Amino acid sequence: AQNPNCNIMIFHPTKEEFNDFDKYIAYMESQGAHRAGLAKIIPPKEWKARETYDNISEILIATPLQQVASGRAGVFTQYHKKKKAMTVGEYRHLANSKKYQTPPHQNFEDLERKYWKNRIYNSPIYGADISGSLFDENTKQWNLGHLGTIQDLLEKECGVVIEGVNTPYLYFGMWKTTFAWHTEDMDLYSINYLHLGEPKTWYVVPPEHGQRLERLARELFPGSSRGCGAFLRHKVALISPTVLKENGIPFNRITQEAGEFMVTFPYGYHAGFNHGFNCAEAINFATPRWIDYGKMASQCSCGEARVTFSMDAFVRILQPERYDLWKRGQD
Numbered sequence: 220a221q222n223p224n225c226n227i228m229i230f231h232p233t234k235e236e237f238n239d240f241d242k243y244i245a246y247m248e249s250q251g252a253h254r255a256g257l258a259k260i261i262p263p264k265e266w267k268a269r270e271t272y273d274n275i276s277e278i279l280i281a282t283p284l285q286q287v288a289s290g291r292a293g294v295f296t297q298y299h300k301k302k303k304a305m306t307v308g309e310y311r312h313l314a315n316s317k318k319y320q321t322p323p324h325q326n327f328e329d330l331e332r333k334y335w336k337n338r339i340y341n342s343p344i345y346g347a348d349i350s351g352s353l354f355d356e357n358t359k360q361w362n363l364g365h366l367g368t369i370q371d372l373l374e375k376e377c378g379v380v381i382e383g384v385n386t387p388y389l390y391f392g393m394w395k396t397t398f399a400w401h402t403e404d405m406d407l408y409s410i411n412y413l414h415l416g417e418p419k420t421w422y423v424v425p426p427e428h429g430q431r432l433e434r435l436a437r438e439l440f441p442g443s444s445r446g447c448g449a450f451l452r453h454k455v456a457l458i459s460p461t462v463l464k465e466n467g468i469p470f471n472r473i474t475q476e477a478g479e480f481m482v483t484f485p486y487g488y489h490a491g492f493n494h495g496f497n498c499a500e501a502i503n504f505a506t507p508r509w510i511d512y513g514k515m516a517s518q519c520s521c522g523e524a525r526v527t528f529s530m531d532a533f534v535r536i537l538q539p540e541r542y543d544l545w546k547r548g549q550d
């Protein structure tokens with residue numbers, strides 16, 4: 220069995236190997252990458268996502284989210300308070316302001332310590348989930364707006380044609396902006412490219428151990444757990460590495476820098492934080508190996524998780540028994 224300790228693997232494809240996305244994902248899995256839940260891909264030196272980032276300031280962040288925490292330093296939830304619209308240029312200035320800027324630090328480890336110590340005492344503002352792309356249309360390799368669609372994958376694997384579309388999302392972050400513990404909708408893959416700026420630290424639980432994280436989360440968030448049998452789908456709960464280690468939960472951590480891709484694998488729980496002003500782009504995708512995960516994915520039916528139009532068909536076709544209850548949650 221490849222990668223039996225479920226370590227995060229890092230890949231350095233050549234320009235020739237960067238041509239065929241599906242084939243490279245399958246190669247990474249042949250080496251056991253999926254066992255970690257997360258892999259890093261460093262593009263060949265010949266590649267670029269676009270020529271410059273000098274002309275992005277007029278992109279609008281229509282609903283910036285202020286991430287307000289409740290709980291204790293290592294075990295907290297966050298809620299998202301909607302703020303007034305601002306441009307990316309306005310947001311970058313805000314991120315660099317004395318109130319919100321990254322503190323002085325020695326190295327990534329020192330900054331990670333400061334994050335876990337102090338996150339709950341601040342409420343950083345995240346420009347998340349903005350439909351759009353920063354890949355140049357002429358970038359032919361690993362262009363996240365030109366991937367094969369999940370609807371086409373389901374059709375190719377299972378023969379059923381379904382409605383829905385699959386497009387990327389931009390994330391503009393600042394120091395302490397936070398992504399809560401989650402897997403993807405329908406336990407899909409994700410791919411995330413850090414276009415610019417400061418790093419993003421990731422934590423991940425191997426898929427084979429995801430239920431260990433769920434059991435801890437039910438212990439640590441007991442009212443949430445009573446409210447919903449899949450409350451990590453709400454994407455609001457954080458648990459620190461110190462707390463995970465105290466409870467024996469297997470996990471790994473890695474820092475993504477600008478110019479690097481991360482891939483999350485089906486049912487790989489992940490969480491993390493941004494080091495300072497940055498911009499990432501991400502999209503979900505599928506492979507043949509995903510289908511069995513999609514069929515088994517938990518679902519939130521309490522009404523909190525509210526998701527895209529396109530998840531309807533996935534539930535309807537892969538999870539027909541759950542469909543009626545899940546759709547009630549959506550309406």
Ligand SMILES: O=C(O)CNC(=O)C(=O)O
Pocket residue numbers: 390397398409410411419483489499501502
């Ligand atoms: O970058 C972020 O805030 C969150 N991204 C992801 O969870 C992802 O790409 O799967």
Ligand SMILES: [Mg+2]
Pocket residue numbers: 274275276277278
């Ligand atoms: Mg612009």
Ligand code: NI
Pocket residue numbers: 401402403409483489
């Ligand atoms: Ni994710």
Ligand SMILES: [Zn+2]
Pocket residue numbers: 446447448449450452453519520521522523524
């Ligand atoms: Zn729920």
